Ligand binder design. Structure first.
Ligand code: ADP
Ligand code: ADP
Ligand code: ADP
Ligand code: MG
Ligand code: MG
Lengths: 52, 526, 105, 43, 260, 536, 49
């Protein structure tokens, strides 16, 4: 698969933040259906900035 | 963690190349060497230990091979071809194994010399075609009406077995049983010796007392002692249904509210039994045989009419009785008719052999089924005698179906080898060498006969080849007892053409099948 | 048609409890010390070693000769140890300056 | 949970074993439930 | 992965969305109106858009696999021996009652089949039934004798989709099975997928109301699943365009503009 | 282990790409030695001693235990090729693996996989177009000889190759026998309607082609006749046993006198049914259900055959061939229980035949339609099974040739011509699609190379000569007939395979190309593998 | 005959057909040339002095 939501759902991530990212991709799929990969990347980049 | 990753599953082996071909050929050669010594009139018996505690002391190749458990798939294929040869023609089981082993042995030489197996297979197929042609050419016809010729053929079939001591009696038994089983209805000829030529073995007595009966014989006694155990000309009625009250198919429940209903129902059961017995009696029979039980009340009603009843006879035995005495098995006695009543049995006698009761329906006039009563030293001896009799009957039926004969004692092998070599002398391609290899590998039968006899293989084989190089010498073989060359017209050892054709075809086809194979893969599940 | 593909409080410093339970502690400790002694005697060798024409001696024949004609009385049998504690107190006891040879078999 | 066989739908979701008129049933871990009210009625 | 097939799939998805909504009134798209059927075999180029209805159930009839001018009716009752909801048994106390029961059961089945046939129906869909035989061997034989193509084991969840597709009102009692309860169609035939299976397609309907089916084919199961996911992504993109009529540039342009 | 925190193993990039290529190469190498006339069979042992001597690629790949996902993809690709075409099962796997190997080699040179996929797709489309426009031969100019040649070509590499002169004739006769037209006037040939029976015994050359149908069944009772001349076959889809009431019917007796009548009726019902069936004039009765002993007696007294537990497909084929009608019940539209003679099939003979201590029913010369059946005779059971597989391959090939009337030369001619054409054509499309199409063309040459290698001949020299011949054919307008030149494996020299009779259906090549390209693209899309640890 | 294994092995290692080489060797030796063996530097079975 190339679908972001499917990739996130298939691999059983364990860390809570990863689970929230999976739920975020699922919500993006529900509301839009496209961009399920871009939204997770955006969230990861935002938190990476939050680090500094 | 981090489990290993691999393409094929675990414990999945694979071998390829010259190793696989060498292993297959060696396995075939080992299988042949197992029973190499069980060929010819001077063969020696082998004692097999069955897994279930039994003992199989036999000389037949197929029995020995089927008593052996092997792991190599080539050995499995060899055992399979032995079984197919046994099932198709009835004998030649140890000859085909040796022939296939020799053909694979001579093919290995060409495999080692940068020859593709396809060329070898093509040469083998051409050789097989010419082998069949030569075998059909050197054949002779047989008058099946001549009893002496048929007896001699059966003798030549059973000279190599343990029954050769009583060969005359064995041949007479086999010929009589085969001719009795022979049947034709609706324009369809049929010789079903598997279902209508039954062999019954009773340990004890002497083998000279063994005989084929003009009827059948079962291990059954009268249901009630008052019934006659000796009827001169019995009218036989055959059944395959119970003579007793039984529950119906549909679920049924009675409901009794008055006093007399219980006794009334029991009386109706008795009256139903009486009605069935009266329906049987209306045909005025003398004996009733059924495959299901007979109630005590039914026995009483039958005895009141002076009728002997046998209770539980197997389906195959009942079919044999119907064929022997001309009866017809029926299920509902109310539909019994005069034609279904079996007249034709000349005697019903229930005598005692040892400590058991046996029922004889012998003395039939024109019976189409028979039983072969065998007496002997023990159970293993009787089993071997039964196997030899099966071989004899199979050979007799093969001759009856195909009246052609070919010389025995290796004469056919050498004649076909010489013809194949003469034909190959005109070949110019590379295929001629495996062709001649097959032709010469055909000579393994006379060599094995000479080796088992104990004579000098090289001198006798060279003399036989030189003799066969002449013109009118296709019937010259080897005497398997005295170890000398002899014309088969004098020794009289002739074998059916069908048996030789089947042996040759099976051997060549097994060689082709095992030559086609490479890259053994094993270990996978289903 | 028919014919188709179909077909917190970490620091405790416990005070008196050890005094109360020292009886059971020593009860187990004596057996544990015996086990350690036995296994020490075994490991003294096991694992550590488990891991890995006058020369013709004509005199050997006559050595065998008088070894065969050695003595008159009964030759006795090799002593057999039946218990591990038997081996332990056999080696522990007995005079120190006397060689003891044991044959595992 | 109790399911309707014909329609293949979950009627009502409420237990090592349980036993049952198909309206009142008892479940043990007693817990008696009545389908007319969907509540525990006995303990 | 289905990007060399975009010339086939993108118009397919656009048509699929446009044929299930009203362009001038719709504010959202229900993607459950676009059924996707995945059949192994062939290549992705064999993906097809079916206007009518595609059923994976096999035809119980033999020798009748193609009906022209079809009249399809849904059956939610059972064509078998009569059986009441409450407990019922038949008690036989005489021998004549046996063949009376047999004859009366035959008459009941024959009357049911005759009532079904009298409406002109030639394609019959039978809903899946549990605890009772939906279709009996006698009933199937009678229907075959009258040249009616019978497809049974129809799932309950698909009843709404079938009714929306072919305009057939479901019937639960034989008394209400009339001509107007049927759904006319131009053709209802069972096609063969080059040895990869059989599909029943009912294409061409008098009232094709807002429903389309997409048949996805491929060489292997994984590529079929991913093709289905990609087609779903395209349908969702068109759904988004329907929900909010606003288009933006791609290729990272919105992100760069946003960052600046 | 790491920041990702996924319970499993992860492989990314060149590692997973090399793993996929290794798995594909392993699958290809398993069956690479069983290609072409100089190919050899294989033994497969099923862990309990079961032996399968086979040459078919689909059988080998199904019987194997395969764990890697790409290997499973190739195995199911072989299965799909077998199901949809029936031939070329080894060739498609070999071509797909070679395509994947060369595509990965391109990817290792920093060529993006999307460009490789686009080039492969374009090359496949162009190859199909070139095959359909240049390398097809219409069968109307050849006649019946083309079918025999195609069957013989399909029988090469099989255990029935040498006896092809006879087996191909048998196959063509059977396929022509099972032919009948349908609506819209498209004569299609329903293979799998040719019943194939395996029975060891005599040689392969004694295999029989039955002008009718063959059943693996025997008469129910020994008292029945075993041969009927003018058979009136009645086909039934119900059992003839004692009548039993259903679940909803109970027998409750309050007066005992009715019990005897009820018990009598329980069998009189079936008696009356059988009496009607015999009164219509039937001679042979075939039923899918069982038959009780009393019913067997009824048939015996009537002097008619009765076969029970007949397979449903066999019964359907018999009814269609003989004109009979399958009856699941005796119930007309008047509510009665009748059986008229219009539902009786006819055959010129029905015989109980004996084949190596086994008996089978032969339905000879069915009227109103022709049917065919084949009985194979071999040394043992493994040989007969391999014969059946080879026979099925030949039947499928003949069906493809008869349905689509175009054939292409065999022996690597098509692959060599396509390689030359695509290598020339790659220069006119794109910049890196050029490399992708060139690699596709060079991968197409694996078939003649494998053929030559299996013959222990100079693969390089033979392939070079074949390529030179095809290039001369393509560049010289007046030497276009050289495009029929293929490989003669017996002598190891190029040969005009169109004149030699080495033919293959065009559908085999086209479907193999399409399926292999799609499988290669599917595997090539992967660049990351996450393998979750099993929950067990 | 056991002496044939040497030229046979040489031909097999050289990559040519041993039978043709041995046949040519017998032919040329019957002609009377006893100094003739297989040509290693040849792609086809050949012999030379
Ligand atoms: N042909 C193209 N050229 C440039 N950018 C593209 C092209 N196609 C898609 N994109 C961009 O790739 C991004 C990712 O799209 P895609 O992978 O299809 O879905 P997702 O947004 O879920 O990852 C989108 O933001 C889009 O702008
Ligand atoms: N008296 C005999 N002298 C010489 N050869 C014989 C004699 N009897 C039988 N043979 C040969 O022995 C073979 C039969 O041996 P047998 O043990 O029956 O082997 P198989 O079981 O394979 O038939 C026949 O081919 C026949 O030519
Ligand atoms: N007589 C022949 N001469 C040259 N080539 C042949 C001959 N017969 C078949 N071939 C070629 O051998 C190739 C391999 O066929 P094969 O592997 O046996 O079929 P499959 O791929 O179905 O197993 C085919 O592509 C065919 O072109
Ligand atoms: Mg014999
Ligand atoms: Mg093939």
């Amino acid at each position: 698969t190339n679908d972001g939501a499917t990739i996130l759902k298939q691999m059983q991530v364990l860390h809570p933040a990863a689970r929230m990212l999976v739920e975020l991709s699922k919500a993006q799929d529900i509301e839009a259906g496209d961009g399920t990969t871009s939204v997770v990347i955006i969230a990861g980049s935002l938190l990476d900035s939050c680090t500094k | 963690g981090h489990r290993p990753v691999l393409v094929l599953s675990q414990n999945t082996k694979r071998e390829s190349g010259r190793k696989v071909q060498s292993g297959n050929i060696n396995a075939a050669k080992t299988i042949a060497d197992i029973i190499r010594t069980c060929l010819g009139p001077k063969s020696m018996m082998k004692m097999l230990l069955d897994p279930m505690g039994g003992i199989v002391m036999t000389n037949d190749g197929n029995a020995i091979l089927r008593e052996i458990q092997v792991q190599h798939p080539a050995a499995k294929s060899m055992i399979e071809i032995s079984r197919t040869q046994d099932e198709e023609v009835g004998d030649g089981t140890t000859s085909v194994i040796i022939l296939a082993g020799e053909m694979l042995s001579v093919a290995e030489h060409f495999l080692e010399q940068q020859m593709h197996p396809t060329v070898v297979i093509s040469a083998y197929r051409k050789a097989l075609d010419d082998m069949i042609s030569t075998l059909k050419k050197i054949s002779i016809p047989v008058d099946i009406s001549d009893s002496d010729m048929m007896l001699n053929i059966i003798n030549s079939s059973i000279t190599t077995k343990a029954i050769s001591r009583w060969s005359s009696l064995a041949c007479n038994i086999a010929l009589d049983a085969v001719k009795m089983v022979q049947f034709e209805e609706n324009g369809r000829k049929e010789i079903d010796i598997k279902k209508y030529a039954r062999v019954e073995k009773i340990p004890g007595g002497i083998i000279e007392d063994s005989c084929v009966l003009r009827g059948v014989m079962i291990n059954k006694d009268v249901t009630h002692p008052r019934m006659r155990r000796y009827i001169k000309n019995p009218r036989i009625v055959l059944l395959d249904s119970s003579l007793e009250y039984k529950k119906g198919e549909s679920q049924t429940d009675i409901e009794i509210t008055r006093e007399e209903d219980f006794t009334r129902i029991l009386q109706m059961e008795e009256e139903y039994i009486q009605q069935l017995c009266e329906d049987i009696i209306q045909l005025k029979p003398d004996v009733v045989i059924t495959e299901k039980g007979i109630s005590d009340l039914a026995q009483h009603y039958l005895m009141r009419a002076n009728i002997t009843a046998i209770r539980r006879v197997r389906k195959t035995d009942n079919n044999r009785i119907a064929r022997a005495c001309g009866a017809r098995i029926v299920s509902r006695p109310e539909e019994l008719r005069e034609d279904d009543v079996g007249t034709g049995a000349g005697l019903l006698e229930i005598k005692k052999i040892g400590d058991e009761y046996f029922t004889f329906i012998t003395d039939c006039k024109d019976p189409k089924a028979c039983t072969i009563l065998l007496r002997g030293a023990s159970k293993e001896i009787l089993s071997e005698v039964e196997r030899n009799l099966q071989d004899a009957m199979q050979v007799c039926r093969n001759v009856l179906l195909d009246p052609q004969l070919v010389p025995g004692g290796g004469a056919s092998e050498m004649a076909v080898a010489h013809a194949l070599t003469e034909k190959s002398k005109a070949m110019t391609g590379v295929e001629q060498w495996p062709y001649r290899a097959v032709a010469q590998a055909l000579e393994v039968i006379p060599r094995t006969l000479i080796q088992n006899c104990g004579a000098s293989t090289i001198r006798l084989l060279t003399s036989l080849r030189a003799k066969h190089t002449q013109e009118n010498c296709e019937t010259w073989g080897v005497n398997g007892e005295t170890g000398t060359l002899v014309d088969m017209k004098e020794l009289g050892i002739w074998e059916p053409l069908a048996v030789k054709l089947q042996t040759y075809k099976t051997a060549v086809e097994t060689a082709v099948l095992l030559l086609r194979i490479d890259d053994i893969v094993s270990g996978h599940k289903k | 048609s028919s014919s188709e593909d179909e077909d917190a409080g970490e620091g405790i410093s416990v005070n008196t409890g050890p005094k109360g339970v020292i009886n059971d502690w020593r009860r187990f400790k004596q057996l544990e010390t015996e086990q350690r002694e036995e296994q020490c005697r075994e490991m003294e060798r096991l694992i550590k070693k488990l891991s890995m024409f006058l020369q013709q001696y004509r005199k050997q024949r006559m050595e065998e000769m008088r070894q065969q004609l050695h003595k008159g009385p009964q030759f006795k049998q090799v002593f057999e140890i039946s218990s591990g504690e038997g081996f332990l107190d056999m080696i522990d006891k007995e005079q120190k300056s006397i060689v003891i040879m044991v044959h595992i078999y | 949970a109790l399911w309707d066989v014909e329609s293949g739908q979950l009627l009502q979701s409420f237990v090592l074993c349980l036993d049952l008129t198909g309206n009142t049933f008892v479940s043990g871990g007693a817990m008696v439930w009545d389908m007319r009210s969907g509540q525990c009625v006995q303990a | 992965v289905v990007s060399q097939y975009s010339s086939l799939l993108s118009p397919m998805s656009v048509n699929a969305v446009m044929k299930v909504i009203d362009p001038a009134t719709a504010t959202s798209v229900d993607l459950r109106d676009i059924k996707i059927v995945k059949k192994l075999g062939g290549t992705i180029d064999d993906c097809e858009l079916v206007e009518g209805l595609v059923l994976t159930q096999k035809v119980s009839n033999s020798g009748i696999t193609r009906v022209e001018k079809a009249k399809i009716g849904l059956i939610q009752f059972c064509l078998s021996a009569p059986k009441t909801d409450m407990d019922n048994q038949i008690v036989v106390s005489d021998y004549a009652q046996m063949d009376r029961v047999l004859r009366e059961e035959r008459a009941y089945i024959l009357n049911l089949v005759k009532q079904i046939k009298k409406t002109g129906c030639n394609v019959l869909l039978i809903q899946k039934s549990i605890l009772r035989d939906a279709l009996s061997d006698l009933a199937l034989h009678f229907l075959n004798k009258m040249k009616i193509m019978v497809i049974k084991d129809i799932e309950r969840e698909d009843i709404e989709f079938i009714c929306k597709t072919i305009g057939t009102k479901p019937v639960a009692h034989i008394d209400q099975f009339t001509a107007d309860m049927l759904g006319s169609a131009e053709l209802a035939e069972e096609v063969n997928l080059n040895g990869s299976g059989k599909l029943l397609k009912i294409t061409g309907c008098a009232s094709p109301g807002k429903t389309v089916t997409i048949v996805v084919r491929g060489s292997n199961k994984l590529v079929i699943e991913e093709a289905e996911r990609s087609i779903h992504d395209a349908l969702c993109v068109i759904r988004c365009l329907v929900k909010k009529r606003a288009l933006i540039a791609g290729g990272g342009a919105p992100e760069i503009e946003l960052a600046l | 282990e790491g920041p990702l925190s996924v319970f499993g193993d992860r492989s990314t990039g060149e590692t997973i790409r090399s793993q996929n290529v290794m798995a594909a190469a392993s699958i290809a190498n398993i069956v690479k030695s069983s290609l072409g006339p100089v190919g050899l069979d294989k033994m497969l042992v099923d862990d309990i001693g079961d032996v399968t001597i086979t040459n078919d690629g689909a059988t080998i790949l199904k019987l194997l235990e395969v764990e890697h996902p790409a290997a499973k993809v190739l195995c199911e690709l072989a299965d799909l090729q077998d199901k949809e075409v029936g031939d070329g099962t080894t060739s498609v796997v070999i071509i797909a693996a070679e395509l994947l190997k060369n595509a990965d080699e391109l990817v290792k040179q920093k060529i993006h996989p999307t460009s490789v996929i686009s080039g492969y797709r374009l090359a496949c489309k162009e190859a199909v177009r070139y095959i359909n426009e240049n390398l097809i031969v219409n069968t109307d100019e050849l006649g019946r000889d083309c079918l025999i040649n195609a069957a013989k070509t399909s029988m090469s590499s099989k255990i029935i190759g040498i006896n092809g002169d006879f087996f191909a004739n048998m196959v063509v006769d059977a396929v022509l026998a099972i032919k009948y037209t349908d609506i819209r006037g498209q004569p299609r040939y329903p293979v799998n309607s040719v019943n194939i029976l395996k029975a060891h015994g005599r040689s392969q050359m004694e295999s029989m082609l039955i002008s009718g149908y063959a059943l693996n069944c025997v008469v129910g009772s020994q008292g029945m006749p075993k041969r009927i001349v003018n058979a009136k076959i009645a086909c039934l889809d119900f059992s003839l046993q004692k009548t039993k009431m259903k679940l909803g019917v109970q027998v409750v007796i309050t007066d005992p006198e009715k019990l005897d009548q009820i018990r009598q009726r329980e069998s009189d019902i079936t008696k009356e049914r059988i009496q009607k069936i015999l009164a219509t004039g039937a001679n042979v009765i075939l039923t899918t259900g069982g038959i009780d002993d009393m019913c067997l007696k009824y048939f015996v007294e009537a002097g008619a055959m009765a076969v029970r537990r007949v397979l449903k497909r066999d019964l359907k084929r018999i009814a269609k061939a003989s004109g009979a009608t399958i009856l699941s019940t005796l119930a007309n539209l008047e509510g009665e229980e009748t059986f008229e003679a219009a539902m009786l099939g006819q055959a010129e003979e029905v015989v109980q035949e004996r084949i190596c201590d086994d008996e089978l029913i032969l339905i000879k010369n069915t009227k109103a339609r022709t049917s065919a059946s084949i009985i194979l005779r071999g040394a043992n059971d493994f040989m007969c099974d391999e014969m059946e597989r080879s026979l099925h391959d030949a039947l499928c090939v003949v069906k493809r040739v008869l349905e689509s009337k175009s054939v292409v030369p065999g022996g690597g001619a098509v692959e060599a011509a396509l390689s030359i054409y695509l290598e020339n054509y790659a220069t006119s499309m794109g910049s890196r699609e050029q490399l992708a199409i060139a690699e596709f063309a060079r991968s197409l040459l694996v078939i003649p190379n494998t053929l030559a290698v299996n013959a222990a001949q100079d693969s390089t020299d033979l392939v070079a000569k074949l390529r030179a011949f095809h290039n001369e054919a393509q560049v010289n307008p007046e030497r276009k007939n050289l495009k029929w030149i293929g490989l003669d494996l017996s002598n190891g020299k190029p040969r005009d395979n169109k004149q030699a009779g080495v033919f293959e259906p065009t559908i085999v090549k086209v479907k193999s190309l399409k399926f292999a390209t799609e499988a290669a693209i599917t595997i090539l899309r992967i660049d990351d593998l996450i393998k979750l640890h099993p929950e067990s | 005959e056991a002496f044939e294994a040497i030229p046979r092995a040489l031909a097999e290692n050289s990559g040519v057909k041993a039978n043709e080489v041995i046949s040519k060797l017998y032919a040329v030796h019957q002609e009377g040339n006893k100094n003739v063996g297989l040509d290693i530097e040849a792609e086809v079975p050949a012999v030379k002095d």
